[PDB]
Amino acid sequence: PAPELLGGPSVFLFPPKPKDTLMISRTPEVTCVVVDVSHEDPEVKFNWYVDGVEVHNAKTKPREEQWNSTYRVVSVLTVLHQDWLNGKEYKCKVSNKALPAPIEKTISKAKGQPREPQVYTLPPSRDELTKNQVSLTCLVKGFYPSDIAVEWESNGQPENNYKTTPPVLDSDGSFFLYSKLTVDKSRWQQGNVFSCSVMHEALHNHYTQKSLSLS
Template sequence: MPGETLTLSCTVTEGGPLGPVKWLKIWGSGNETIYDQKDPSSRGMRAVNDSSTDFTILIKDIHPKDAGTYYCVKFRKTATGDELYRRGNGTVVLVQARPSNPTLTRPKYRVQPGKKASFTCKTWGFFPSDINVKWYKDKTLIQPQLPNVTPGPSKFTYNMSSTVTVTLQKDDIRSELTCQVGHTTLTAPLTRSYHLRQILRVPPSKVVVQPLGPVGLNETVSFTCYVQGFYPGSVTVTWLENGKEIKTASTPRPIETPEGLFELRSTVVVQAVPEKNISVFTCRAVHEGQDPLSSSATLWVDASGQQGCSSGGTGTRGLWGWGLWGWGLRSPQPALTPLFLQVPISCP
């Protein structure tokens, strides 16, 4: 395991030819000198310094890069230099390395209910390559794609990525996605979890403006807009009067429901003056920068008071009612439209 001390044993026969003893590590097509009698700075250290036959060495604080096949080699001194005399059978060293703590990546943008979202779990720097990955949505095991295990940047380590795709639901605001990694070097699995509310976007289920019946002249009335069932709680509400924005609305902060969604109530106060009769008030809600949702209601001013009347004379009374419009060949169904009638009356 990384951080431990590796012991490599070697014994040579006494009375052999003159020449040094070295330890070499072979990996792939290359080799590396681990211990050299002539180089005190080499990575391997003699376990018994004064012995002429025991060339056991210690390698402290090993890492995955120390994996390979190690050979104890006896060289013979010649006039032209040192030449190979004899070597051991070799010792294969594999350094187990535990996986890194997993990371989890998600889509860049929020996803609506009914749409698919992909999540990827990654870990790296482990050895051997056998690794187990499980995904859970809350406590339910879900099936991911086959994990992708690739060689790491250093020798004898591996990287892994695993991807799962889930179809999000409105009630996933309370759900959690978990990647669980198992490996022979671990006593317990490594996990990384993600709250699905961080990626979920639930548009408002409804935007409703409560309609009003006819109201008296100069009465103060309120139109109330209900924006229901959205997540996250960031929504912008704008009021329009006959298509023109008005600034007098009151919009408190959204309220969280027991299901984890949000709802909001916005109110605009209007005085029922004659000029506002048949004015259309529209509540427009924009959630998370998406297309606006809107609902409208019309202000009906009851102008039934007497107008232009003098004693002993005549005057008029204004009445609101409904009339038929569009009855004919091109419009087989009648349409109702509001009518304002001036009805003559006798003044007292």
């Protein structure tokens, strides 16, 4: 059955994916999400502002039934790459009948001097070579803001069998992370060059790439 929701809906406002802001070929988005919307008063009205000035290009998604008999209602505003990076503030305003006033939320990029990531690749431990799979390692560090993207490639083709860590606040107020790519030991032993690819605003052309292979 439906819960009581005495407080009405609530808003959450997410930023663009870091890759999207950085590659001009891609489409960056802010995403305003309203939850705890009732069946009785399910209309949500959205107003979007950039640095105070209103914009109308938002896309209006259909509402979605959740497991608790409330609606999840989203508006999505595409944005320009330079604006976000320049730190324009993106304000979502939400108006629903079950509230006494509109709820406003804002999101900009983190403030603070951006810092270039230093990218280092590290081969497998001597002790891991007994295993059938090995761990190739990419360390990204001394970067700010935390917004970053990392993938792997070999010989022109993407390698997808990796996991990257969340960024970690280092002790000089920069961030670091480790990505780890698991590959078959043969592909390593054959002499194939794998590559860490890192994307971040402080990097030249938002892109750098370190390679790594048997020696």
